[PDB]
Design a protein around this ligand. Structure first.
Ligand SMILES: O=C(O)c1ccncc1NCc1ccc(F)cc1
Ligand code: NI
Ligand SMILES: [Zn+2]
Length: 347
């Protein structure tokens, strides 16, 4: 009923080359349609548009810190541990990925492969070429350029003088079958953008920002030690929870598969997790809109080891509230249903 409530189901958008050219505006637009309530959206770019000519010239690209993903647990609850393996090229990676030991099993419909992920994620540890600093977009590309999105996030670099790897800059992820991203929201509960350049697909789970507290209480319950140690432990990106557990404890969630050539957008306080289907390459970064600012102020951060100074945002966009805020007396309540103020124009 809220479980099925499609005001909170993941939407897909098919913009035109005119609609597409302006990134910030199009984000405002999909929010005017409620996209943000699912916590994740898909945007299919126009058929003409291409970030690069071909992906045949990247065999030599270096993945400095490949991670091997060791998973332990049972009954739909798992903890993922990373081992940094040594540096290796895209070609060595592809070979390992497309090899007979680590390749995608046989499947008819997406749901058979999902069963095989949840049955086999603790066996046969895959290698993810994650968090590689780089961009695969050719220099000429002006539409949806992950390297330069022109949002209000740019303030961190412009005013504050600060570079934050993978947040203000783009990252690449070379996947193989059964490589995983655990349940998280973004750093400082930012938006994210993810573009699947080539290869096999990426499946996603999303929990609506209006039920994220539910997922937090659930994780806390199942990992009481972890939660005593850090009050944002999900941010460690180590915790995997299956769809069956979510259903069982009444956490609303949706799923979607991202195919090569498609963007995914995650929204503030949008919890997501997922897995790669086989060999692929995605590019991601974070970004912001005016709505983000309050989520930024309220974001509960890891208290046991990324932090963005919000002053620069409050002074500029909430000058009237700055003193009160610095005092500790601002207590706006976030309403996760509300579009960003930039979307007034779409009525
Ligand atoms: O890998 C993805 O596709 C992904 C997607 C969305 N958010 C975070 C993501 N990855 C986070 C992550 C970072 C490093 C890892 F080793 C594993 C996962
Ligand atoms: Ni993410
Ligand atoms: Zn922590």
């Amino acid at each position: 009923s809220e479980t099925l409530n499609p005001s909170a189901r993941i939407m897909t958008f098919y913009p035109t080359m005119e609609e597409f050219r302006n990134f910030s505006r199009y984000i405002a637009y999909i929010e005017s349609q409620g996209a943000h309530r699912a916590g994740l959206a898909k945007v299919v770019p126009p058929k003409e548009w291409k970030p690069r000519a071909s992906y045949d010239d990247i065999d030599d690209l270096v993945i400095p810190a490949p991670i091997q993903q060791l998973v332990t647990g049972q009954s739909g609850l798992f903890t993922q541990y990373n081992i940094q393996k040594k540096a290796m090229t895209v070609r060595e990676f592809r070979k390992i990925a497309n090899s007979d030991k680590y390749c995608t099993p046989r499947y008819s419909e997406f749901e058979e492969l999902e069963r095989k992920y949840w049955k086999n994620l603790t066996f046969n540890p895959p290698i993810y070429g994650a968090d590689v600093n780089g961009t695969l977009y050719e220099k000429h590309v002006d539409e949806w350029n992950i390297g330069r999105l022109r949002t209000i996030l740019d303030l961190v670099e412009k005013e504050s003088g600060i570079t934050i790897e993978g947040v203000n800059t783009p990252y690449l992820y070379f996947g193989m079958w059964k490589t995983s991203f655990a349940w998280h929201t973004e750093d400082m509960d930012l938006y994210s953008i993810n573009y699947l350049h080539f290869g096999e697909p990426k499946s996603w789970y999303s929990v609506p920002p209006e039920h994220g507290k539910r997922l937090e209480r659930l994780a806390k319950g199942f990992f009481p030690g972890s939660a005593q140690s850090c009050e944002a432990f999900l941010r460690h990106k180590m915790t995997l929870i299956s769809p069956l557990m979510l259903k069982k404890y009444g956490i609303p969630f949706d799923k979607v598969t991202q195919e090569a050539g498609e963007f995914m957008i995650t929204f503030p306080y949008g919890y997501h997790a997922g897995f790669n289907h086989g060999f692929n390459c995605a590019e991601s970064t974070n970004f912001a809109t005016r709505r983000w600012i309050e989520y930024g102020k309220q974001a509960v951060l890891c208290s046991c080891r990324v932090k963005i100074s919000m002053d620069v945002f409050v002074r500029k966009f909430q000058p009237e509230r700055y003193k009160l805020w610095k005092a500790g007396k601002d207590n706006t309540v976030i309403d996760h249903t509300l579009p960003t103020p930039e979307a007034a124009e779409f009525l």
